[PDB]
Amino acid sequence: RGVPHIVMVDAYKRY
Amino acid sequence: SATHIKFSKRDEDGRELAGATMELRDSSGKTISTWISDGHVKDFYLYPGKYTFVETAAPDGYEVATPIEFTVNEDGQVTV
């Protein structure tokens, strides 16, 4: 419990 | 001592995303780890310092994300 979650989002290319 | 953190590489729909080429660097430019995201959260244990998650390449069809800097404090608090 309490472990930090670091999130990196990869967005879609328009295609 | 070392602090447990989790890193998640996700898509725009909140789902873990496999195939991204990633690295974790410290404030002096040393590479702590390189890996390919596998569609699950990735755990790390890190000593106090300033670090950066850097995406070298995204899977086909995705855009590379901006690097994420964070600090592991002397007391185990992590700040993003």
Numbering used by the authors:
A (entry chain B): 108 to 122
B (entry chain A): 23 to 102
Original authors' sentences:
The SpyCatcher system derives from the collagen adhesion domain of Streptococcus pyogenes, in which an internal irreversible isopeptide bond spontaneously forms between the side chains of a lysine and an aspartate residue. In 2012, the Howarth group split the protein into the so-called SpyCatcher001 domain, containing the lysine residue, and the SpyTag001 peptide, containing the aspartate. They showed that, when the two are mixed in solution, the covalent isopeptide bond spontaneously forms on a timescale of minutes at micromolar concentration, recapitulating the original protein. The group later used a phage display platform and selective mutation targeted towards enhancing electrostatic complementarity to develop the SpyCatcher002 and SpyCatcher003 variants, each with higher affinity and speed of isopeptide bond formation.
We first crystallized and solved the structure of the SpyCatcher003–SpyTag003, which had not previously been solved. In all structures, the isopeptide bond distance between the nitro­gen atom of Lys31 and the gamma carbon atom of Asp117 is within 1.4 Å. Compared with the SpyTag001 constructs, the SpyTag003 version contains three additional residues at the N-terminus which are visible in the density. The SpyCatcher003–SpyTag003 system was previously engineered from SpyCatcher001–SpyTag001 with the aim of speeding the Catcher–Tag binding interaction to a rate approaching the diffusion limit. Towards that goal, positive charge was introduced to the N-terminus of SpyTag003 in the form of R108 and G109 to promote interactions with the negatively charged region defined by E20, E21, D22 and E96 in the SpyCatcher domain. To compensate for the additional positive charge in SpyTag003, the mutations K37R, Q62H, A89P, T91E and Q97D were introduced into SpyCatcher003. A89P was also engineered to reduce flexibility in the 79–89 loop which lines one side of the SpyTag docking region. These changes do not affect the overall fold, as shown by the similarity of the 001 and 003 structures, pointing to the stability of the Catcher–Tag complex. We used MX to obtain the crystal structure of the SpyCatcher003–SpyTag003 complex, validating the AlphaFold predicted model, and showing that the mutations introduced to produce the 003 system from the 001 system did not substantially change the folded conformation of the protein. The tighter affinity of the interaction reported earlier between SpyCatcher003 and SpyTag003, as well as the fast kinetic phase, detected both globally and locally in the current study, might be associated with the added stabilization of the activation state by the engineered electrostatic interactions.
